[PDB]
Each structure stands twice: as C-alpha cells, then as structure tokens.
Amino acid sequence: MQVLPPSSTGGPSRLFIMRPVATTLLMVAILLAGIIGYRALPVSALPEVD
Amino acid sequence: NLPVDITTQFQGSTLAFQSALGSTVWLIVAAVVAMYIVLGILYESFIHPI
C-alpha cells in the first residue's frame, strides 16, 4: 500500500479505532500469555549452540 | 508397626483422576477467557459476552 490519501482520516489503521473491546481484550490476552509464558517458557543459561 | 524401611506407591485411577482435577480448573478458566475475548471481538461491547 503506497502513499494514498488517508481513507476517511484513519490511514492504514482506520479500523483499529473502531474496535474498543477487541483491542482491550487483545492486550488482556497478550498480557496473560506473557505472564503464563514467563512462568512456563524455558529460560536457560546459554543458547543451544553445541 | 512395620519396619521403617517399608514404603508405598500407587498407580492408575488415582494418578489419572488427580491429573484430570489439575487440568480441569485451568482448562475451564482459559476456555472462559477465550470465549469472552472472541465474543467481545464479535460484538464490540462489554456486557454482551457476559
């Protein structure tokens, strides 16, 4: 998508301002996934470079 | 009054049922969170998914 005139003054992110609940729940899910990952993903001392 | 070197160990239904109990609560919580998120995406509202 090249430099087009803004679509009804929203740019390429126009639909994003039309989704309040969607955004709020998306970032709630992102925070929950990050918390359960930091409690679940595998933290090692060194990379697996053998 | 068995000798102190006598221990016990069990297998089968007890382990399966304990694993099921451990999995059920987290499964229900994650599922309910997922439905809340998708329904909020579909309706763009707070109390409609509830």
Side-chain angles (χ1 to χ4, degrees), chain B residues 1 5 9-11 18 21 24 29 33 38-39 41-42 48-50:
Chain B
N1 330 96
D5 38 301
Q9 184 264 0
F10 306 84
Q11 279 298 321
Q18 199 161 16
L21 279 197
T24 300
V29 163
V33 164
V38 194
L39 285 157
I41 291 159
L42 292 206
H48 294 16
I50 323 176

PDB file of all heavy atoms in Angstrom, chain B residues 1 5 9-11 18 21 24 29 33 38-39 41-42 48-50:
ATOM      1  N   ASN B   1       2.920 -51.696  62.739  1.00  0.00           N
ATOM      2  CA  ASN B   1       4.292 -51.476  63.252  1.00  0.00           C
ATOM      3  C   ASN B   1       5.305 -52.076  62.288  1.00  0.00           C
ATOM      4  O   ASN B   1       6.222 -52.789  62.715  1.00  0.00           O
ATOM      5  CB  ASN B   1       4.449 -52.006  64.673  1.00  0.00           C
ATOM      6  CG  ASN B   1       3.161 -51.953  65.460  1.00  0.00           C
ATOM      7  OD1 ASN B   1       2.447 -52.959  65.525  1.00  0.00           O
ATOM      8  ND2 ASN B   1       2.849 -50.814  66.064  1.00  0.00           N
ATOM      9  N   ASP B   5      11.570 -49.214  56.985  1.00  0.00           N
ATOM     10  CA  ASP B   5      12.042 -49.230  55.581  1.00  0.00           C
ATOM     11  C   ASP B   5      10.956 -49.778  54.658  1.00  0.00           C
ATOM     12  O   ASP B   5      11.296 -50.342  53.602  1.00  0.00           O
ATOM     13  CB  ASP B   5      13.302 -50.068  55.472  1.00  0.00           C
ATOM     14  CG  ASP B   5      13.291 -51.308  56.351  1.00  0.00           C
ATOM     15  OD1 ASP B   5      13.162 -51.155  57.581  1.00  0.00           O
ATOM     16  OD2 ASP B   5      13.385 -52.420  55.804  1.00  0.00           O
ATOM     17  N   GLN B   9       3.476 -47.112  47.192  1.00  0.00           N
ATOM     18  CA  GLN B   9       3.397 -46.397  45.909  1.00  0.00           C
ATOM     19  C   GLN B   9       2.167 -46.926  45.169  1.00  0.00           C
ATOM     20  O   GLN B   9       1.881 -48.146  45.241  1.00  0.00           O
ATOM     21  CB  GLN B   9       4.667 -46.610  45.095  1.00  0.00           C
ATOM     22  CG  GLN B   9       4.711 -45.830  43.786  1.00  0.00           C
ATOM     23  CD  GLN B   9       4.266 -46.653  42.599  1.00  0.00           C
ATOM     24  OE1 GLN B   9       3.910 -47.825  42.729  1.00  0.00           O
ATOM     25  NE2 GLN B   9       4.284 -46.048  41.421  1.00  0.00           N
ATOM     26  N   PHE B  10       1.471 -46.039  44.461  1.00  0.00           N
ATOM     27  CA  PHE B  10       0.195 -46.433  43.807  1.00  0.00           C
ATOM     28  C   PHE B  10       0.203 -45.986  42.375  1.00  0.00           C
ATOM     29  O   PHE B  10       0.937 -45.029  42.005  1.00  0.00           O
ATOM     30  CB  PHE B  10      -0.983 -45.797  44.543  1.00  0.00           C
ATOM     31  CG  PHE B  10      -1.020 -46.079  46.034  1.00  0.00           C
ATOM     32  CD1 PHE B  10      -0.289 -45.321  46.937  1.00  0.00           C
ATOM     33  CD2 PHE B  10      -1.790 -47.121  46.512  1.00  0.00           C
ATOM     34  CE1 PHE B  10      -0.331 -45.611  48.288  1.00  0.00           C
ATOM     35  CE2 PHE B  10      -1.827 -47.406  47.860  1.00  0.00           C
ATOM     36  CZ  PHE B  10      -1.100 -46.652  48.745  1.00  0.00           C
ATOM     37  N   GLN B  11      -0.631 -46.632  41.572  1.00  0.00           N
ATOM     38  CA  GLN B  11      -0.689 -46.274  40.133  1.00  0.00           C
ATOM     39  C   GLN B  11      -2.107 -46.435  39.584  1.00  0.00           C
ATOM     40  O   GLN B  11      -2.911 -47.178  40.194  1.00  0.00           O
ATOM     41  CB  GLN B  11       0.256 -47.158  39.310  1.00  0.00           C
ATOM     42  CG  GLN B  11       1.717 -46.721  39.344  1.00  0.00           C
ATOM     43  CD  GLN B  11       1.919 -45.342  38.755  1.00  0.00           C
ATOM     44  OE1 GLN B  11       1.288 -44.985  37.759  1.00  0.00           O
ATOM     45  NE2 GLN B  11       2.793 -44.551  39.359  1.00  0.00           N
ATOM     46  N   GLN B  18      -6.235 -37.426  39.637  1.00  0.00           N
ATOM     47  CA  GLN B  18      -5.514 -36.227  40.132  1.00  0.00           C
ATOM     48  C   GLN B  18      -5.077 -35.347  38.952  1.00  0.00           C
ATOM     49  O   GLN B  18      -5.207 -34.112  39.034  1.00  0.00           O
ATOM     50  CB  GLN B  18      -4.307 -36.660  40.958  1.00  0.00           C
ATOM     51  CG  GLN B  18      -3.780 -35.569  41.883  1.00  0.00           C
ATOM     52  CD  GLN B  18      -2.923 -36.118  43.002  1.00  0.00           C
ATOM     53  OE1 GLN B  18      -2.464 -37.264  42.954  1.00  0.00           O
ATOM     54  NE2 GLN B  18      -2.696 -35.301  44.021  1.00  0.00           N
ATOM     55  N   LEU B  21      -8.134 -33.533  37.629  1.00  0.00           N
ATOM     56  CA  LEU B  21      -8.507 -32.395  38.509  1.00  0.00           C
ATOM     57  C   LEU B  21      -7.540 -31.221  38.291  1.00  0.00           C
ATOM     58  O   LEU B  21      -7.992 -30.070  38.237  1.00  0.00           O
ATOM     59  CB  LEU B  21      -8.500 -32.818  39.975  1.00  0.00           C
ATOM     60  CG  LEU B  21      -9.737 -33.565  40.483  1.00  0.00           C
ATOM     61  CD1 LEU B  21      -9.733 -33.532  42.002  1.00  0.00           C
ATOM     62  CD2 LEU B  21     -11.024 -32.964  39.940  1.00  0.00           C
ATOM     63  N   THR B  24      -8.469 -29.629  34.860  1.00  0.00           N
ATOM     64  CA  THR B  24      -9.835 -29.117  34.633  1.00  0.00           C
ATOM     65  C   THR B  24      -9.986 -27.650  34.954  1.00  0.00           C
ATOM     66  O   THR B  24     -10.601 -26.918  34.169  1.00  0.00           O
ATOM     67  CB  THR B  24     -10.822 -29.971  35.439  1.00  0.00           C
ATOM     68  OG1 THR B  24     -10.744 -31.334  35.015  1.00  0.00           O
ATOM     69  CG2 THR B  24     -12.246 -29.473  35.270  1.00  0.00           C
ATOM     70  N   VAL B  29     -10.864 -22.182  33.033  1.00  0.00           N
ATOM     71  CA  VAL B  29     -10.559 -20.728  33.145  1.00  0.00           C
ATOM     72  C   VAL B  29     -10.076 -20.199  31.786  1.00  0.00           C
ATOM     73  O   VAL B  29     -10.576 -19.153  31.320  1.00  0.00           O
ATOM     74  CB  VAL B  29      -9.512 -20.496  34.243  1.00  0.00           C
ATOM     75  CG1 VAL B  29      -8.882 -19.116  34.103  1.00  0.00           C
ATOM     76  CG2 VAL B  29     -10.140 -20.665  35.617  1.00  0.00           C
ATOM     77  N   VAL B  33     -12.050 -17.471  29.386  1.00  0.00           N
ATOM     78  CA  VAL B  33     -11.358 -16.229  28.943  1.00  0.00           C
ATOM     79  C   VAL B  33     -11.399 -16.150  27.409  1.00  0.00           C
ATOM     80  O   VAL B  33     -11.641 -15.058  26.861  1.00  0.00           O
ATOM     81  CB  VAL B  33      -9.919 -16.230  29.484  1.00  0.00           C
ATOM     82  CG1 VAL B  33      -9.071 -15.201  28.754  1.00  0.00           C
ATOM     83  CG2 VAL B  33      -9.904 -15.964  30.982  1.00  0.00           C
ATOM     84  N   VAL B  38     -13.315 -13.634  22.288  1.00  0.00           N
ATOM     85  CA  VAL B  38     -13.846 -13.707  20.903  1.00  0.00           C
ATOM     86  C   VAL B  38     -15.233 -13.055  20.829  1.00  0.00           C
ATOM     87  O   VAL B  38     -15.548 -12.410  19.829  1.00  0.00           O
ATOM     88  CB  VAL B  38     -13.858 -15.166  20.422  1.00  0.00           C
ATOM     89  CG1 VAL B  38     -14.068 -15.216  18.920  1.00  0.00           C
ATOM     90  CG2 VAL B  38     -12.541 -15.846  20.765  1.00  0.00           C
ATOM     91  N   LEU B  39     -16.035 -13.221  21.865  1.00  0.00           N
ATOM     92  CA  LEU B  39     -17.388 -12.632  21.815  1.00  0.00           C
ATOM     93  C   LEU B  39     -17.286 -11.111  21.897  1.00  0.00           C
ATOM     94  O   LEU B  39     -18.083 -10.418  21.244  1.00  0.00           O
ATOM     95  CB  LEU B  39     -18.239 -13.203  22.943  1.00  0.00           C
ATOM     96  CG  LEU B  39     -18.708 -14.639  22.707  1.00  0.00           C
ATOM     97  CD1 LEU B  39     -19.046 -15.338  24.009  1.00  0.00           C
ATOM     98  CD2 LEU B  39     -19.877 -14.679  21.732  1.00  0.00           C
ATOM     99  N   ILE B  41     -14.860  -9.472  20.658  1.00  0.00           N
ATOM    100  CA  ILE B  41     -14.430  -9.085  19.291  1.00  0.00           C
ATOM    101  C   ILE B  41     -15.665  -9.047  18.390  1.00  0.00           C
ATOM    102  O   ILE B  41     -15.800  -8.109  17.585  1.00  0.00           O
ATOM    103  CB  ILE B  41     -13.367 -10.072  18.784  1.00  0.00           C
ATOM    104  CG1 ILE B  41     -12.062  -9.917  19.562  1.00  0.00           C
ATOM    105  CG2 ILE B  41     -13.142  -9.895  17.286  1.00  0.00           C
ATOM    106  CD1 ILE B  41     -11.148 -11.123  19.493  1.00  0.00           C
ATOM    107  N   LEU B  42     -16.540 -10.025  18.526  1.00  0.00           N
ATOM    108  CA  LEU B  42     -17.696 -10.108  17.600  1.00  0.00           C
ATOM    109  C   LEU B  42     -18.711  -9.010  17.881  1.00  0.00           C
ATOM    110  O   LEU B  42     -19.361  -8.564  16.943  1.00  0.00           O
ATOM    111  CB  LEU B  42     -18.369 -11.471  17.758  1.00  0.00           C
ATOM    112  CG  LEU B  42     -17.590 -12.712  17.302  1.00  0.00           C
ATOM    113  CD1 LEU B  42     -18.571 -13.813  16.934  1.00  0.00           C
ATOM    114  CD2 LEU B  42     -16.667 -12.399  16.141  1.00  0.00           C
ATOM    115  N   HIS B  48     -22.313  -7.706  26.733  1.00  0.00           N
ATOM    116  CA  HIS B  48     -22.961  -8.669  25.816  1.00  0.00           C
ATOM    117  C   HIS B  48     -22.308 -10.055  25.889  1.00  0.00           C
ATOM    118  O   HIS B  48     -23.050 -11.062  25.936  1.00  0.00           O
ATOM    119  CB  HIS B  48     -22.965  -8.098  24.403  1.00  0.00           C
ATOM    120  CG  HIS B  48     -23.815  -6.880  24.254  1.00  0.00           C
ATOM    121  ND1 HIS B  48     -24.266  -6.143  25.327  1.00  0.00           N
ATOM    122  CD2 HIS B  48     -24.294  -6.265  23.157  1.00  0.00           C
ATOM    123  CE1 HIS B  48     -24.989  -5.120  24.889  1.00  0.00           C
ATOM    124  NE2 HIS B  48     -25.021  -5.175  23.575  1.00  0.00           N
ATOM    125  N   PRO B  49     -20.975 -10.214  25.866  1.00  0.00           N
ATOM    126  CA  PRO B  49     -20.422 -11.551  26.020  1.00  0.00           C
ATOM    127  C   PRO B  49     -20.815 -12.196  27.337  1.00  0.00           C
ATOM    128  O   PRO B  49     -21.034 -13.420  27.389  1.00  0.00           O
ATOM    129  CB  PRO B  49     -18.908 -11.327  25.925  1.00  0.00           C
ATOM    130  CG  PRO B  49     -18.771 -10.068  25.127  1.00  0.00           C
ATOM    131  CD  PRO B  49     -19.942  -9.215  25.556  1.00  0.00           C
ATOM    132  N   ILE B  50     -20.886 -11.402  28.401  1.00  0.00           N
ATOM    133  CA  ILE B  50     -21.336 -11.953  29.710  1.00  0.00           C
ATOM    134  C   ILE B  50     -22.789 -12.427  29.573  1.00  0.00           C
ATOM    135  O   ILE B  50     -23.154 -13.426  30.218  1.00  0.00           O
ATOM    136  CB  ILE B  50     -21.172 -10.897  30.810  1.00  0.00           C
ATOM    137  CG1 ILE B  50     -19.908 -10.078  30.587  1.00  0.00           C
ATOM    138  CG2 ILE B  50     -21.175 -11.562  32.183  1.00  0.00           C
ATOM    139  CD1 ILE B  50     -19.725  -8.942  31.575  1.00  0.00           C
TER     140      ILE B  50
END
